[PDB]
Amino acid sequence: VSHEQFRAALQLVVDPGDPRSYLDNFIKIGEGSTGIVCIATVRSSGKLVAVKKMDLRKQQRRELLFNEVVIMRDYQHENVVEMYNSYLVGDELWVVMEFLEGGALTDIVTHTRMNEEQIAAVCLAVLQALSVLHAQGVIHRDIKSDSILLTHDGRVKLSDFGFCAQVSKEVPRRKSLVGTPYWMAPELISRLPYGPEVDIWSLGIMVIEMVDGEPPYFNEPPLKAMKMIRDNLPPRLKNLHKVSPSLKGFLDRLLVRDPAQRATAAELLKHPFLAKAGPPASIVPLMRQNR
Amino acid sequence: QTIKCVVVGDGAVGKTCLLISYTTNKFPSEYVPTVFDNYAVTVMIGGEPYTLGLFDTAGQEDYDRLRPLSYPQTDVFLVCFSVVSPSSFENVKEKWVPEITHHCPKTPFLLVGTQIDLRDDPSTIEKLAKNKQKPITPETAEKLARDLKAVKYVECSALTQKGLKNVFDEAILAAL
């Protein structure tokens, strides 16, 4: 029953009508956790776009679909994948966004060790985004390599905005258990109220992915890992002899159990490590089509 | 795998009602005190389906030695009180928490405030004012929970189904 009320709300928020009117050649590319991703072709230019389709009846928390529209619409940034448009197609929300031919960082990190220049480039790009989101009290909530995407030319964009929440003077922390198990901050698993800091913890995990190829406790089943994260000390890298003090010291600022001592996005922006960041080109060798 | 929940709190607290509200999305029209009832639903978490074995017990005094025979291998407990019965809230500390502690020490437990729809109700707020008392606030409850020493405090209306699923959602998390 509540379906209808929700579908109606959504209709008013999206752009009217159907995009099959201007796009051909819908083909699935992958899944997210919320719905499939297709590629498609603008009929009048032959230009490629991607399209995220999400069924309303298949959501664990339907409401979250409102961020897909609000985020891209209002938080347009150089390091944020550009949403062009959104639409309702029957029972599916369809978001039309730019096509990131470079793929995701997950593919790169499970197949290759990136050097600190390339890593620093990545974290720079993401923190530029998170500074700006957090500046407005917006927590992403699902930072992991999967959520980072690349262009052909090596540029880096954050995406997968479906899990985001907002805080403010009035509601300053959040409480929902949201995110992927291995990247979850310890306070969130512990069920305490939390703010943007959760994102920075997760970025610290993603640095571990970039360095060591997977997150801590990957082999465990999620719910065992969640416990260990919560109960244990911050995970450390596995081979420090190879890592520079700049980066080790950088990471010791992300992976801090107490959130109050953990570094903010703006603090991290001013961090010596990020000044090793290579140009977009320094990344392009990492992409599959190149290897 | 199975999850074994056990629900405890004073009579009337509407422990029976809470369970049925969630499981069947129906409210019991008649008040009946529970001796012992066992309802088993199935919950799917991350695509993994889990039989949730719920244990409705007696909130009465008569079954002090008959109730805890339901406790072997309990993965989690709900410790419940009506937010509009400061007596039942008092008996969290006094009777309930101690009881389950002993039988099952390493076992977790959430604090639960019930019938929260009756807070702003004038007639129940009248009934309490006639014994110079008032409704329990979250500020209060969440001090007790931290201190006592629960996983957390949760609250819900079996009637309106406000906050209901979440209680059961957090319990599962706690259990697993």
Curated annotation (Swiss-Prot), chain A:
Q: Which residues form the active site?
A: 142
Q: Which residues carry this modification: Phosphoserine?
A: 176
Q: Where is this region: GEF-interaction domain (GID)?
A: 1-25
Q: Where is the Protein kinase domain?
A: 23-274
For ATP, which residues are the binding ones? 29-37, 52, 98-100, 160-162
- Provide the protein's localization: Cytoplasm
Query: In which tissues does this protein get expressed?
Result: Highest expression in prostate, testis and colon.
Recount the PTM note: Autophosphorylated on serine residues when activated by CDC42/p21. Phosphorylated on tyrosine residues upon stimulation of FGFR2. Methylated by SETD6.
Q: Which family does it belong to?
A: Belongs to the protein kinase superfamily. STE Ser/Thr protein kinase family. STE20 subfamily.
Subunit composition?
Interacts with FGFR2 and GRB2. Interacts tightly with GTP-bound but not GDP-bound CDC42/p21 and weakly with RAC1. Interacts with INKA1. Interacts with SH3RF2. Interacts with RHOU and PAXI; the PAK4-RHOU complex protects RHOU from ubiquitination and acts as a scaffold to suppport paxillin/PAXI phosphorylation.
User: What role is this protein assigned?
Assistant: Serine/threonine-protein kinase that plays a role in a variety of different signaling pathways including cytoskeleton regulation, cell adhesion turnover, cell migration, growth, proliferation or cell survival. Activation by various effectors including growth factor receptors or active CDC42 and RAC1 results in a conformational change and a subsequent autophosphorylation on several serine and/or threonine residues. Phosphorylates and inactivates the protein phosphatase SSH1, leading to increased inhibitory phosphorylation of the actin binding/depolymerizing factor cofilin.
Q: What is this protein called?
A: Serine/threonine-protein kinase PAK 4
Q: Span of the full-length protein shown?
A: 299 to 589 of 591
Curated annotation (Swiss-Prot), chain B:
**Chain residues that bind GTP:** 9-16, 56-60, 114-117
Q: How is its activity regulated?
A: Regulated by guanine nucleotide exchange factors (GEFs) which promote the exchange of bound GDP for free GTP, GTPase activating proteins (GAPs) which increase the GTP hydrolysis activity, and GDP dissociation inhibitors which inhibit the dissociation of the nucleotide from the GTPase.
Entry-annotated residues carrying (Microbial infection) O-AMP-threonine? 34
Q: Does the keyword ATP-binding apply?
A: no
**Which keywords does this Swiss-Prot/TrEMBL entry list?**
Cell membrane, Cell projection, Cytoplasm, Cytoskeleton, Differentiation, Disease variant, Glycoprotein, GTP-binding, Hydrolase, Intellectual disability, Lipoprotein, Membrane, Methylation, Neurogenesis, Nucleotide-binding, Phosphoprotein, Prenylation
- On whether Phosphoprotein is a keyword of this UniProt record, the answer is yes
- Origin superkingdom: Eukaryota
What InterPro entries does the annotation carry?
A: Cdc42 (IPR037874), P-loop_NTPase (IPR027417), Small_GTP-bd (IPR005225), Small_GTPase (IPR001806), Small_GTPase_Rho (IPR003578)
| GO CC terms | apical part of cell; cell-cell junction; centrosome; cytoplasm; cytoplasmic ribonucleoprotein granule; cytosol; dendrite; endoplasmic reticulum membrane
The modified positions for (Microbial infection) O-AMP-tyrosine read 31
Which disease is this protein implicated in? Takenouchi-Kosaki syndrome: An autosomal dominant syndrome characterized by macrothrombocytopenia, lymphedema, intellectual disability, developmental delay, and distinctive facial features.
Assembly: Interacts with CDC42EP1, CDC42EP2, CDC42EP3, CDC42EP4, CDC42EP5, CDC42SE1, CDC42SE2, PARD6A, PARD6B and PARD6G (in a GTP-dependent manner). Interacts with activated CSPG4 and with BAIAP2. Interacts with activated CSPG4 and with BAIAP2. Interacts with DOCK11/Zizimin2; the interaction activates CDC42 by exchanging GDP for GTP. Interacts with DOCK9; the interaction activates CDC42 by exchanging GDP for GTP. Interacts with DOCK8 (via DHR-2 domain); the interaction activates CDC42 by exchanging GDP for GTP. Interacts with IQGAP1. Interacts with NET1 and ARHGAP33/TCGAP.
Q: Name the chain's protein.
A: Cell division control protein 42 homolog
Species of origin? Homo sapiens (Human)
